[PDB]
Amino acid sequence: QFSTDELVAEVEKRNRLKLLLPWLEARIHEGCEEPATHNALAKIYIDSNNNPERFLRENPYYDSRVVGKYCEKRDPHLACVAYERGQCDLELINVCNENSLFKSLSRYLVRRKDPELWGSVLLESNPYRRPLIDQVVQTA
Amino acid sequence: KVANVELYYRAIQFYLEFKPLLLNDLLMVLSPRLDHTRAVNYFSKVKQLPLVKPYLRSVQNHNNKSVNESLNNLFITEEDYQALRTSIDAYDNFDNISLAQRLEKHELIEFRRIAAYLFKGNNRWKQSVELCKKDSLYKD
Numbered sequence: 001q002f003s004t005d006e007l008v009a010e011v012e013k014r015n016r017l018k019l020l021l022p023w024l025e026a027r028i029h030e031g032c033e034e035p036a037t038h039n040a041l042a043k044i045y046i047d048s049n050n051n052p053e054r055f056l057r058e059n060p061y062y063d064s065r066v067v068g069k070y071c072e073k074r075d076p077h078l079a080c081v082a083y084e085r086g087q088c089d090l091e092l093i094n095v096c097n098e099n100s101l102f103k104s105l106s107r108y109l110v111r112r113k114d115p116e117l118w119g120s121v122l123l124e125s126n127p128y129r130r131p132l133i134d135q136v137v138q139t140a
Numbered sequence: 141k142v143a144n145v146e147l148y149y150r151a152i153q154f155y156l157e158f159k160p161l162l163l164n165d166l167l168m169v170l171s172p173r174l175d176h177t178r179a180v181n182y183f184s185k186v187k188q189l190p191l192v193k194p195y196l197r198s199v200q201n202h203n204n205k206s207v208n209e210s211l212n213n214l215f216i217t218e219e220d221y222q223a224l225r226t227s228i229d230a231y232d233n234f235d236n237i238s239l240a241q242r243l244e245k246h247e248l249i250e251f252r253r254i255a256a257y258l259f260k261g262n263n264r265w266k267q268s269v270e271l272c273k274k275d276s277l278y279k280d
Contacts, residue, residue, distance in 0.1 A: 134143035138143070
């Protein structure tokens, strides 16, 4: 009997998550579909100074929320993809609208064609509407 | 690659005030997504239209009204008619009477000859034929 999604919180204070690479590597080699491990793999991949964008896109087991909040300040360019496949549209606007290239947003909305999303965005509450429209005029 | 259009009408003024000689390149580049009518209407105020004449000669294909009228005025001032015959023949989006008023008293046999010509484009004899009684007993 063992807890998996909180040893990561423990070692986070100790800042030695690379310690957990081999065991979790074998664990995923077995092929466990646990978000508790599939998100920690992404988190250590982020701190690797590498580009884990394709592992982020082709791993249909982790959860978009924790990687997004984690990759909020460190790299929104990956958090937006996390929300994209995770369909976290509200969080996408909650971060990517604030500080990002809004072209990726417009690519997602035109891709993920959803009138209610345009309605939520296009009501003159959001101060950042002019740049994203000034971008989607070209992205369309 | 710009979203809005008013920056065109500001940048034309910018160059014209600063680097007017390098304006023709922008004009040729920017003619497609541009209301040339406003351009000529604005240039009439500052009156640098004699500069941009060869550009309008290219834009003539669109067959705009103010374009035709202004470029014909410039042919009048330049005192050239061979190009004027091509303009009126190939393009007709303009009033014939205003041009006729100027051509029928342009001090010159040929311009008055055109003033007699274009009347029949309106199907108005008895003035053209009668206008050229005054000068042309040479068969015209």
